[PDB]
Design an enzyme around this catalytic site. Sequence first.
Site, mmCIF file in Angstrom:
data_model
loop_
_atom_site.group_PDB
_atom_site.id
_atom_site.type_symbol
_atom_site.label_atom_id
_atom_site.label_comp_id
_atom_site.label_asym_id
_atom_site.label_seq_id
_atom_site.Cartn_x
_atom_site.Cartn_y
_atom_site.Cartn_z
ATOM 1 N N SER A 181 0.797 -1.218 0.000
ATOM 2 C CA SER A 181 0.000 0.000 0.000
ATOM 3 C C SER A 181 0.839 1.282 0.000
ATOM 4 O O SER A 181 0.562 2.210 -0.764
ATOM 5 C CB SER A 181 -0.992 -0.014 1.173
ATOM 6 O OG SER A 181 -0.343 0.072 2.432
ATOM 7 N N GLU A 213 12.106 -7.884 -2.089
ATOM 8 C CA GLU A 213 12.359 -6.598 -1.441
ATOM 9 C C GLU A 213 13.741 -6.565 -0.796
ATOM 10 O O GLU A 213 14.477 -5.576 -0.932
ATOM 11 C CB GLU A 213 11.287 -6.308 -0.393
ATOM 12 C CG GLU A 213 9.925 -5.995 -0.988
ATOM 13 C CD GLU A 213 8.834 -5.817 0.059
ATOM 14 O OE1 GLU A 213 9.012 -6.267 1.213
ATOM 15 O OE2 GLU A 213 7.787 -5.218 -0.290
#
Lengths: 222, 224
Positions: free
Chosen positions: B35, B108
């Site tokens: 998000s 990531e």
Amino acid sequence: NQDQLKQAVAQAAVDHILPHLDSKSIVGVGTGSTANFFIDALARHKAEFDGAVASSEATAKRLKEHGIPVYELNTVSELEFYVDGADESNERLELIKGGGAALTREKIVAAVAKTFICIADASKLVPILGQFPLPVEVIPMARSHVARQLVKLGGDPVYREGVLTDNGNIILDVHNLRIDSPVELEEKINAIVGVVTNGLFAARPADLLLLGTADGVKTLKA
Amino acid sequence: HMNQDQLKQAVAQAAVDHILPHLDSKSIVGVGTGSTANFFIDALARHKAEFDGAVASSEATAKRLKEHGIPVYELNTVSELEFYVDGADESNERLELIKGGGAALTREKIVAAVAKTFICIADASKLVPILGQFPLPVEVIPMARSHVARQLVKLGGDPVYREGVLTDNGNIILDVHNLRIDSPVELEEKINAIVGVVTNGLFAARPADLLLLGTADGVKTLKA
């Protein structure tokens, strides 16, 4: 020859574990040429144990072809034995594995087994690990990053063209390491983000090494 | 009063403000997943004519970047990456993080390793005294589930398999509850010693370099 040395150690492993087996025994099984002789020799005694846990899809298939039940590792908390080959062992029973590209699931099954029996022909026993390039399983998008980090450790990494492991990862084979301290190097390589597993079985080494020589099979301990 | 989305937008824009003077036509930006990272993509895309493109930390992020008209490059094609910008689930005051709520922790962590400067962008609630209330994600080879769970129990955790989830890399996640992580660098290393672990969600040995924190009274700029 080498195949007959492999056949000999495979049979030696069967003979070693056989008296220990019963109807509850589940045997952890390696992958590759030496392990395959072990599978075929073990199958001649399939009535003597329950089943097996495989370290690869290839091994699972071969076990099933012999009518040996194959169970997922997730269904056990311990295995008495795991039997597998290696590319090198030193005299402390620290190994280089992964020539056959199955190092990850092999290392995981070995972790669950109480006794890891390594079966190998004599030429695989070396004074110092590293002449055989060290396999490292790597997330594919991490190839360049992990190669750079392996160079920092004094290695020359080489991508194994066209190979994907059962887990969908690539392998970098690392040349020109003089691995005087396998436990330490194993830990250093595990500190590289993008590494799935490395082929040093050192922190959890073999417990028993059955070595096929011209004078028969020798049993080595650390 | 600002809602959580608005705090995320504030830090997303703060990250763009920080990096913009440092971007030229050859700049490639590493981009997180989830998000907060998506709000960053919104803000960054307004400047796409000023830089080269981006490296994605997930297939979802690659799609979001392309949808915004930002070129996407594979990490393997770069060695020089100045910035990686991403959210987190928790940070402590030393900028050590728990990540992986969004299931993208592995790629990531890899992109963050290549980047010189990791900017973590987060709303205020994510700064905690001690890591661990948010369960620690651990990415695990699926056939290693029971083994890795046993080893995590030995470390004082309660590992719970995350139902119905496979990561971009084909692995499961164990979310580890009940840890009080007083030494994140040490625990990160201990978990990496468990065979069957692909990556764990502690970004501690390589922590964030800059933390932009969105609060009701403005963005805070924090360093370890």
